[PDB]
From a paper:
Progenitor sequence of the assigned 28 sequences was generated by ancestral sequence reconstruction, and the generated sequence exhibited L-lysine oxidase activity; thus, we named the enzyme AncLLysO. AncLLysO has a fold typical of the flavin-dependent amine oxidase (FAO) superfamily —the Rossmann-core fold, which recognizes FAD, and a hot-dog-like fold, which is important for the recognition of substrates. Taken together, we assigned a novel FAD-dependent enzyme, called LLysO and bearing a main L-Lys α-oxidase and promiscuous monooxygenase activity, from the database. The main-chain amino group of L-Lys is deprotonated by an activated solvent water molecule, and the hydride on the main-chain carbon atom is transferred to FAD.
Previous research indicates that, in many FAD-dependent oxidases, the Lys residue at the site would recognize the O2 molecule, which oxidizes the FADH2, and their variants quietly reduce the activity. In AncLLysO, K387 corresponds with the residue, and the activity of the AncLLysO(K387A) variant was reduced below the detection limit of the activity assay as expected. Crystal structures of the L-Lys- and L-Arg-binding forms of AncLLysO(K387A) were determined at 2.4- and 2.2-Å resolution, respectively, using the cocrystallization method. Rearrangement of the active site structure would be induced by the binding of L-Lys. Specifically, the side-chain Y254 moved away from the active site, associating with the cis–trans transformation of G251, and simultaneously the side chains E383 and Y516 flipped into the active site to recognize L-Lys. Next, we attempted to represent structural changes of AncLLysO that are induced by the binding of substrates. Structural comparison between AncLLysO(LF)- (green) and the L-Lys-binding form of AncLLysO(K387A; magenta) are shown in Figure 5D, suggesting that dynamic structural changes could be confirmed at the following residues: 251 to 254, 383, and 516. The active site residues E383 and Y516 moved to the optimal position to recognize the L-Lys associating with the conformational change of the plug loop in AncLLysO. Structural comparison between AncLLysO and other LAAOs may be helpful to predict how AncLLysO exhibits high substrate specificity toward L-Lys. Superimposed structures of AncLLysO(K387A), AncLAAO, and VioA are represented in Figure 5D, indicating that the size of the active site of AncLLysO is narrower than those of AncLAAO and VioA, as the site was formed mainly by bulky aromatic residues (Phe and Tyr). The narrowing of the active site in AncLLysO made binding to amino acids other than L-Lys difficult; therefore, this could be one of the reasons that AncLLysO exhibits high specificity toward L-Lys.
Numbering used by the authors:
A (entry chain B): 1 to 271, 274 to 586
B (entry chain A): 1 to 586
The structure:
Amino acid sequence: NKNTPLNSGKHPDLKIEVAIIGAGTSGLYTAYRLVTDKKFKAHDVQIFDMNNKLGGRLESVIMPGMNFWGELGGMRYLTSQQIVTTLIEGYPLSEKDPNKRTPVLKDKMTPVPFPMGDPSKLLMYLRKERFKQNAWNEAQKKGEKLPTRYYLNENDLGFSSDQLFNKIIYDVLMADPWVAETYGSKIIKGSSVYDYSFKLTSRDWDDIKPKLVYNFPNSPYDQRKVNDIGFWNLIKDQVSQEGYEFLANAGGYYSNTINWNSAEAFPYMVGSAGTIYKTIEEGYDSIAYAVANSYMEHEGACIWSENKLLTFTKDHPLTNTHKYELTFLNLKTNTQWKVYANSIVLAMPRKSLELLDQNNFFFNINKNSVLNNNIRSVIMEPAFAILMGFEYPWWKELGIDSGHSITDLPMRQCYYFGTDPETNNSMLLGSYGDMETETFWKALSDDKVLFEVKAAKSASLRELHQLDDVQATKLMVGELMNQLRELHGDTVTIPEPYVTYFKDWTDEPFGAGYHAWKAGFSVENVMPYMRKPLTDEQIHICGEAYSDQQGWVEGAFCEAEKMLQEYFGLDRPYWLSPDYYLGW
Amino acid sequence: NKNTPLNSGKHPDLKIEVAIIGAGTSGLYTAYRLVTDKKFKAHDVQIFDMNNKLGGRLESVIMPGMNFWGELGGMRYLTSQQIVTTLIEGYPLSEKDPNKRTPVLKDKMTPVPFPMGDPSKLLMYLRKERFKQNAWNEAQKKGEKLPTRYYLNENDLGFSSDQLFNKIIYDVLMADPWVAETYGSKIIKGSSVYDYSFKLTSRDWDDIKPKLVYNFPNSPYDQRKVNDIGFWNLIKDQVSQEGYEFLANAGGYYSNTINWNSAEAFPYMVGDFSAGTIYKTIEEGYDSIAYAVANSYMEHEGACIWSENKLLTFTKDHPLTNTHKYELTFLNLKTNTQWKVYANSIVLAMPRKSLELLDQNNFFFNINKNSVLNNNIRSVIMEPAFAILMGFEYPWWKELGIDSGHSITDLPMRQCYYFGTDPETNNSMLLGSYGDMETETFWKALSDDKVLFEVKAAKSASLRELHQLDDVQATKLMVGELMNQLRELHGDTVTIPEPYVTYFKDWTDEPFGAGYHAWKAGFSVENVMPYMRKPLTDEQIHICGEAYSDQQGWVEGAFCEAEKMLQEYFGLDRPYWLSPDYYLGW
Ligand SMILES: Cc1cc2nc3c(=O)[nH]c(=O)nc-3n(C[C@H](O)[C@H](O)[C@H](O)COP(=O)(O)OP(=O)(O)OC[C@H]3O[C@@H](n4cnc5c(N)ncnc54)[C@H](O)[C@@H]3O)c2cc1C
Ligand SMILES: Cc1cc2nc3c(=O)[nH]c(=O)nc-3n(C[C@H](O)[C@H](O)[C@H](O)COP(=O)(O)OP(=O)(O)OC[C@H]3O[C@@H](n4cnc5c(N)ncnc54)[C@H](O)[C@@H]3O)c2cc1C
Ligand SMILES: N[C@@H](CCCC[NH3+])C(=O)O
């Protein structure tokens, strides 16, 4: 099922219609739709990737001793996300009997609820104070305002990150008279001082984001579109720099507090009625294999692996039959070869576009200044993944079965991932890094001395030594361990891990775990621009990077889907609800 | 003096010996040394720069209404920095009467002390608590430990940033039995629990840096070289993450607490010992020293700075291989035309970002061939810096008894310098400097906004005179928000009027990409610097400047790497005016 054939060879002067570069979710989706809907013969639609596997920022692994999937990248979806959810669970989404669902993909994918853990037992370690994540509510129940070691404005005393986030969004929304008048019924202040709520639809947000004005006559930002203010800028303005410190640390990875587009950050922070987080039992990269395999069933279909796009020109022998000559580097031989095509789908993030030849007709800055301006419209957020295997789930000593702990320590957030009921070998995702913490972790992960795998139950040295290459560094494992002991306190002994799995998503060609719209850009005009930057060229960009659901597979799918409907003459899939809002 | 001629023209197929690219301090210094010592005729040594001025990261400006120089880049030097000090002040450095000194450069430069201000009156604003910088020392004088809103380890309670830094570096140095035994006399615990001091020379540090071992039994970094540990990694290990938070915030810009090479951070933090040394500047603007070196170079006949001429690439494959090893292709920015220069030596007097912006596919940079060059180019952190000069109609900071110096905060602005009052006009200058600890991204969104602060007349400053600065004004959003932070910083007992003029430079802009550079942990710095001065054995191509110096942040770093390069590969002797006991390493 994950043995989808990959061709690391070359086919000099291959002639095709559509060259898809990026075997990520969006590249795979594009190929699947084109050939499934018979817009093109499989042999005329080809995917190229420089990697030695498909899926890009989806990579599921198994570590000896633990018979279940760890995620180095994407790990879960929301049933709000209708392209990825329908693909996994069949259609229609309304049918709630899973045996009256019609499958869309053949590949076996077993949906399973994402365990969220217990906030009575999940930790919050801020400025050396240890809390249960529930401590703000428990204090509110008892009429109290929880003291913390952040000096908030007095009006915000006792608030939780979530409630204070809600208050900031409510306050800013209601200060726009037009937003108050038109959507005030969807922007609700409850009875309790802490309770705010929203019923704003994706559609309502597309109306609000380009028009929202920041209405605060003493602020340096007064009478500016919220589109034009960084989220850090905006949060400090509303609740002081100590307010921003509290939210940026207490929010964890569920929160994006970088200084990105306030207008885009609003819906990102406050969310479709009755949705939940799920994953796939067979690994979250199963959705990529499933889309890939559906494409590769057609003979002529090919993923060219370990083949890196260098450049592309209109000035080549074959202009009578093919607009574009693409030059590929075949990595196994270090030889270049040519591919001829009439359409190019760059299914790749910002960093991957910047690593392509910047001097060709498409990227040359002396011609396409506007394209380069639009490529630079998104922040490249760093992420890494360190998976750690322990001989027993030491976290269960604190009544923690699953979920995440949050700290202002450089580790920021850990996920208690699961236990092998036969071995008791148990998995932590210790990581992701982010704001500032990239440089803290990068000095340690760049170090040359790798963690030494250690034998465990159902995990022999000769099984483990196959993972030598992908171990975290001793310095990074040592220091993460030191922080986990500090995070969890002295009432639990944490033993040394026996195996690790490390990936850094800042590495080329990814340059980022995820992307974030910059303040000052008309997101609603950039997105359609990137799906076809030049009027008289059949070159398209798709993927998560320039989507409005950054952070998610669903963003990559939606930009591919819109590109398909816009330029490749496809209708909405038969299996996708006509009410799922896509946009323009 | 600052009217040094620049040639924005071209001269196709110019045939020289040494092309120096970058008319910054190291490039100017290289050309000045080469001609003054008569190693080549001035027509055989040319300087090319893409800028419309010389000086690079030195740029001194005058704003209408204020008859004194503001600094967009470098401000100050230390009298222990012997090249930059001797070129400014003349020699010998022992002579304490300036009128008894012997000039080295003909251009006149008035050395003045850099006002450091009064720690009684300068502010520290941390987690919404307002301190005077001397509050820690005041508390200790009464036998007290000053509580703060940072939850230090108990053993560290009541330490100032300066004291806690010395304790950290003392503790780490002294835990190494070799360092203890060999340099314990120069690593000094005073009487008070807060008093740590260092007498380690430049030479002592060069012996210590590669050898020092982190000796803390249950540390994650135990038994590793301190050179292989990030400074944030080390600080946290030593005083907890709350301690790092205190030290990173309360440290000025003086302080470099990014996660760079710990071995290199130690000397940066506690000086190369000459305890009688002080900070000074040039009355005529700190860029004066670039102009003095550049003018000394230009008084030789055939000397030329090619301005607005950008190096694109260079090759060994050209028609003239019989006389000239290298063809350089420049872009003449005025005509948008490419012209060639032929040369046998290339001096890239430019930082990391500048190197990376050159053609990476040529024989020199090609990563498929020169993996070691590329690793080493990437051995320094590009640290962001912005400068915003703000001119007010009076020095509102005098209401708090502040004459000069720096106030420090955890607010995004991080630090402001009170730069001076024009005694005729009362027009008074403030610098906000910011960029470290993620404040880059806070400020970038505001400085990338396109509505600019509008100038406004004041005494001896007419809109006619101010409108020439329209293009260099800060954004309105940035000036508004910095003004809001200065009000929060100083408190509600002083009214801060809106300013009448600003001046913004972003040093992350190309081709600089950084204010200054920082060695990464885990590199053999003592081996990377010699490499960078001549990466390839078969090639007379050399890199000099501040970025790969061991005095990062400083003009003296640029001068020293050029000086070493001149002695190593251009057969120059030590300048007659430079003490032979000024340590330049190997
Ligand atoms: C740590 C982390 C956690 C995440 N968690 C989740 C989550 O829980 N849920 C979720 O839905 N999403 C999550 N995501 C995001 C999700 O993984 C991505 O949004 C999605 O996989 C991106 O797909 P894409 O189509 O944009 O392409 P990418 O995944 O970016 O793939 C692009 C491909 O292009 C290839 N390429 C680049 N340049 C070239 C070239 N010159 N020639 C050939 N090939 C080239 C690369 O090798 C790569 O395979 C997470 C991401 C990370 C990093
Ligand atoms: C905010 C700030 C504060 C500082 N404070 C001090 C201080 O107080 N005291 C002190 O001593 N030092 C200070 N410094 C450091 C000092 O300014 C620098 O270290 C010094 O100027 C570095 O000189 P350099 O030779 O490395 O070249 P740079 O000054 O980096 O100049 C390099 C030159 O190369 C040119 N160039 C690059 N690429 C090309 C190309 N392709 N073609 C043509 N030209 C090119 C650039 O235009 C530039 O003119 C400060 C720096 C900054 C940013
Ligand atoms: N979707 C990601 C989080 C997005 C991160 C954006 N900075 C996850 O669930 O892990």
